[PDB]
Amino acid sequence: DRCTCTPNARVFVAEGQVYCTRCLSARSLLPLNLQVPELGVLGLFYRPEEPLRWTLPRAFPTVECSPAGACWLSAIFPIARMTSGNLNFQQRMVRVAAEIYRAGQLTPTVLKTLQVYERGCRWYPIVGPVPGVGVYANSLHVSDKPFPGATHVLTNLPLPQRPKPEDFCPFECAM
Amino acid sequence: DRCTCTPNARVFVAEGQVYCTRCLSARSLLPLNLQVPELGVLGLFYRPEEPLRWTLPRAFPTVECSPAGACWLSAIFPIARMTSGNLNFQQRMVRVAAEIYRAGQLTPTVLKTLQVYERGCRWYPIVGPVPGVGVYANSLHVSDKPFPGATHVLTNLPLPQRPKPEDFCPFECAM
Ligand SMILES: [Zn+2]
Ligand SMILES: [Zn+2]
Ligand SMILES: [Zn+2]
Ligand SMILES: [Zn+2]
């Protein structure tokens, strides 16, 4: 039982799995006939409706950048979950993906547009394990799980450490 | 940087880590001088204030029961997160742990007391990967992650499958 939406339905990455932004079901590999070579790893699952507006170089996942080239695909779910409630999530997931996909990267400006801070998320200097969902990051990459190099974690959890002021963001352009 | 609360502060298990119910920081092993042998694995981190009211047999984690004997320690965080908001979580975490610890097991009655269903959680027959936090289970055990044997997943996520009526619960006594 996999996702059966039109292949132009956006995708996000949680832990290992590629999931559909529309139905939240695991996404299988695209038929290669539909695959969009110009979109690296993303094109292996996502086939947009029209142009691209930006491209993705096919590559291997680095110990810190995964999916290689568009690690922000990994921040879509955590930002949406920490930024919505029970009867509000779908709408949120859809708006968060659209924003990020459009920008083709994660940036302080895209986080402001998404009101991540006003909704309860705070960055924290990683000093140990953090339970639940979150966005781990450094000055160039982000992930939904900890990784070698990550220096900060974005969470809505009332942590013991001291939150970073709202003007702070570990990166300028996480890709 | 670990937890530095009084050792009588309750504990919960998320993924691998043992975390403190009070400060949400990782919990180190108890000095063995404080360790409470009568509380199996739990006693290796948690030292109550007075009696026990129930005991825990020391053992090895089974492919389906972990922590061995009190796998419900793994359901504390997911139930609390899916059942609270941003400015409400701590209170929720504290009430959820106390309830479960008292009952010394997870049961349909303890889930009703915690109003898991009225707050948005629904059980679903596992048919594929599910992103985010959740409680995986079968008729005898539960976990915060999928495991060989699990047949159902409790989530507040608006999944595509069809939710189980509110009278349904995969188990009668998950320990
Ligand atoms: Zn879909
Ligand atoms: Zn990257
Ligand atoms: Zn503590
Ligand atoms: Zn068990």
Side-chain angles (χ1 to χ4, degrees):
Chain A
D1 201 54
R2 233 70 171 171
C3 157
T4 317
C5 289
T6 57
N8 78 304
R10 296 186 189 73
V11 160
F12 67 85
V13 188
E15 293 210 53
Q17 275 303 315
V18 173
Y19 292 91
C20 169
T21 283
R22 274 228 269 292
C23 68
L24 310 167
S25 301
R27 255 277 247 295
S28 285
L29 282 163
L30 224 48
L32 167 63
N33 298 294
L34 294 164
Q35 283 177 19
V36 180
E38 316 88 70
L39 292 178
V41 179
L42 181 56
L44 314 178
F45 304 82
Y46 173 69
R47 191 183 195 307
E49 269 292 9
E50 301 186 356
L52 279 43
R53 82 187 282 108
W54 53 248
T55 233
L56 181 63
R58 242 283 206 174
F60 297 86
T62 290
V63 290
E64 66 176 5
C65 180
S66 186
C71 62
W72 44 267
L73 279 175
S74 171
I76 303 191
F77 180 70
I79 291 168
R81 195 85 225 57
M82 311 189 279
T83 280
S84 60
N86 270 50
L87 307 312
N88 187 42
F89 182 79
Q90 293 183 299
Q91 188 222 74
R92 195 61 194 172
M93 166 54 69
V94 176
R95 306 283 293 177
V96 170
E99 275 298 331
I100 293 179
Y101 266 65
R102 178 165 77 179
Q105 53 178 49
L106 203 39
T107 194
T109 288
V110 173
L111 292 175
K112 289 171 179 173
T113 303
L114 291 183
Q115 291 163 164
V116 157
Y117 187 94
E118 95 125 56
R119 283 160 185 271
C121 295
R122 300 280 176 285
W123 284 104
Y124 294 88
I126 299 168
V127 282
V130 175
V133 298
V135 182
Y136 292 77
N138 60 194
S139 62
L140 280 150
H141 316 282
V142 302
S143 183
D144 68 312
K145 283 289 186 292
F147 62 92
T151 69
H152 297 282
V153 60
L154 176 66
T155 185
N156 63 170
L157 218 48
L159 297 187
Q161 299 116 66
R162 333 198 325 108
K164 254 57 243 303
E166 51 186 307
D167 16 290
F168 184 85
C169 185
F171 53 80
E172 290 292 75
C173 174
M175 296 198 285
Chain B
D1 201 54
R2 233 70 171 171
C3 157
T4 317
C5 289
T6 57
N8 78 304
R10 296 186 189 73
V11 160
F12 67 85
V13 188
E15 293 210 53
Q17 275 303 315
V18 173
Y19 292 91
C20 169
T21 283
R22 274 228 269 292
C23 68
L24 310 167
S25 301
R27 255 277 247 295
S28 285
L29 282 163
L30 224 48
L32 167 63
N33 298 294
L34 294 164
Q35 283 177 19
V36 180
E38 316 88 70
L39 292 178
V41 179
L42 181 56
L44 314 178
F45 304 82
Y46 173 69
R47 191 183 195 307
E49 269 292 9
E50 301 186 356
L52 279 43
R53 82 187 282 108
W54 53 248
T55 233
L56 181 63
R58 242 283 206 174
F60 297 86
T62 290
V63 290
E64 66 176 5
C65 180
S66 186
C71 62
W72 44 267
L73 279 175
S74 171
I76 303 191
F77 180 70
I79 291 168
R81 195 85 225 57
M82 311 189 279
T83 280
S84 60
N86 270 50
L87 307 312
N88 187 42
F89 182 79
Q90 293 183 299
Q91 188 222 74
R92 195 61 194 172
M93 166 54 69
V94 176
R95 306 283 293 177
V96 170
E99 275 298 331
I100 293 179
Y101 266 65
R102 178 165 77 179
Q105 53 178 49
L106 203 39
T107 194
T109 288
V110 173
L111 292 175
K112 289 171 179 173
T113 303
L114 291 183
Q115 291 163 164
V116 157
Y117 187 94
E118 95 125 56
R119 283 160 185 271
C121 295
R122 300 280 176 285
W123 284 104
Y124 294 88
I126 299 168
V127 282
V130 175
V133 298
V135 182
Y136 292 77
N138 60 194
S139 62
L140 280 150
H141 316 282
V142 302
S143 183
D144 68 312
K145 283 289 186 292
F147 62 92
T151 69
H152 297 282
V153 60
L154 176 66
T155 185
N156 63 170
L157 218 48
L159 297 187
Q161 299 116 66
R162 333 198 325 108
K164 254 57 243 303
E166 51 186 307
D167 16 290
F168 184 85
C169 185
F171 53 80
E172 290 292 75
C173 174
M175 296 198 285

